[PDB]
Design a protein around this ligand. Structure first.
Ligand SMILES: Cc1cn([C@H]2C[C@H](O)[C@@H](COP(=O)(O)OP(=O)(O)OP(=O)(O)O)O2)c(=O)[nH]c1=O
Ligand SMILES: [Mg+2]
Ligand SMILES: [Mg+2]
Length: 342
DNA sequence: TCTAGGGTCCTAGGACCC
DNA sequence: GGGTCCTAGGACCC
């Protein structure tokens, strides 16, 4: 009863799009990210920049210290959305069982597909070739019987390559697979697991489920499952967005309420425009604000509210400012909405 | 080096309901 | 006491 799941993942997505649209960037180190003066981080980097150690989520000041000639780009999100829509239309040529996880990646369930003699290996190759033929961008892919193995597999032969895990190969693959490779196991969880002597799925296989359930809750069940190749999550295709948020980090911290309110005045019409694209009457379930301080602690306060309203967001930010700020600088202000449950 | 902005999901205490 | 909604925080992902 094995499913065939493909995970398709665009190579250096934002940067690949910028290089196609400006071939002068093809061989120099480039990254999409905010300037050091805007206190930015790297969204992504091309392979010439990665060679220096430049990575996603790296602070831009660190990226430039590693790669002084890094060319920093602002990002063209409509260009990326356009490429995303196109590759999702290419996925639809092969199956309707498509769960996009972000602009540049998706799960495909091709169990019931009849496109390349039921070969998921060849469907993945054909999708990657079509994407290259029609978008001049490359993609990598992973093929496995379950979601998480497919997603791990798509990383192992990038860029512009794929990797297939058959059911026969799953036990040997798992034995030495680091836990940190499992989606959902991040730095904090991996360090906790490491401090129990648990580094790989093989380690977790020698663990008692009751033990993991005590020390991790529902996460310990997931750890126990994945360590055996168990991942029953179905490819959905029905997921909908639940929130809309708009936030900005200032180049310098602000110390005065007048400055905070001015920022909100600039953020609010952007939040309204994005909400209106999906709910034109602006009806919502909750709205709220976010402050982040110069020491990097952050607070959110949100509440039931029927319709996007600027003055209530200002009032709420003023309460949060007055109450939970303690003379610190503020580096970030954000606005937030929770969408109604349709 | 000095730490984004777009999000999802889980936890957990108290309110509230029965 | 058992279920369920509000809310803040935080790990995590892209
Ligand atoms: C991981 C990450 C990605 N992104 C954006 C930029 C990425 O190009 C896009 C998709 O992310 P990824 O697929 O994680 O990264 P990538 O495509 O650039 O690199 P890879 O070739 O390894 O797949 O999302 C961020 O803005 N911040 C992040 O921390
Ligand atoms: Mg990618
Ligand atoms: Mg991706």
């Amino acid at each position: 009863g094995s499913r065939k799941i493909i995970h398709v993942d665009m190579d250096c997505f934002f940067a690949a799009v910028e290089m196609r649209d400006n071939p002068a960037l093809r061989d120099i180190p480039i990254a999409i990210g905010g300037s050091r003066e805007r206190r930015g981080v790297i969204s992504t980097a091309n392979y010439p920049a990665r060679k220096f150690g430049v990575r996603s989520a790296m602070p831009t000041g660190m990226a430039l210290k590693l790669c002084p000639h890094l060319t920093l780009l602002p990002g063209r999100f409509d260009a990326y959305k356009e490429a995303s829509n196109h590759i999702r239309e290419i996925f639809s040529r092969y199956t309707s069982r498509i769960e996009p996880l972000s602009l540049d990646e998706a799960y495909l369930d091709v169990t019931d597909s009849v496109h390349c003699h039921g070969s998921a290996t060849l469907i993945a190759q054909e999708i990657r070739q079509t994407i290259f033929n029609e978008l001049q961008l490359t993609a990598s892919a992973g093929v496995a019987p379950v979601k998480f193995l497919a997603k791990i597999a798509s990383d192992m032969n990038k860029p512009n390559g794929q990797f297939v895990i058959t059911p026969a190969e799953v036990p040997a693959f798992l034995q030495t697979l680091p836990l940190a490779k499992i989606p959902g196991v991040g730095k904090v969880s991996a360090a906790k697991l490491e401090a129990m002597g648990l580094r790989t799925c093989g380690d977790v296989q020698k663990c008692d489920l009751v033990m993991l359930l005590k020390r991790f809750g529902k996460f310990g069940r997931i750890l126990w499952e994945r360590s055996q190749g168990i991942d029953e999550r179905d490819v959905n295709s029905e997921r909908l967005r639940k929130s809309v948020g708009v936030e900005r980090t200032m180049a310098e911290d602000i110390h005065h309420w007048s400055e905070c309110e001015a920022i909100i005045e600039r953020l609010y019409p952007e939040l309204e425009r994005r909400l209106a694209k999906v709910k034109p009457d602006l009806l919502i379930a909750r709205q709220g604000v976010k402050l982040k301080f110069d020491d990097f602690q952050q607070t959110t306060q949100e509440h039931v509210w029927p319709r996007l309203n600027k003055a209530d967001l200002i009032a709420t930010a003023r309460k949060t400012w007055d109450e939970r700020r303690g003379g610190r600088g503020v580096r970030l202000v954000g606005l937030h909405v929770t969408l109604l449950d349709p």
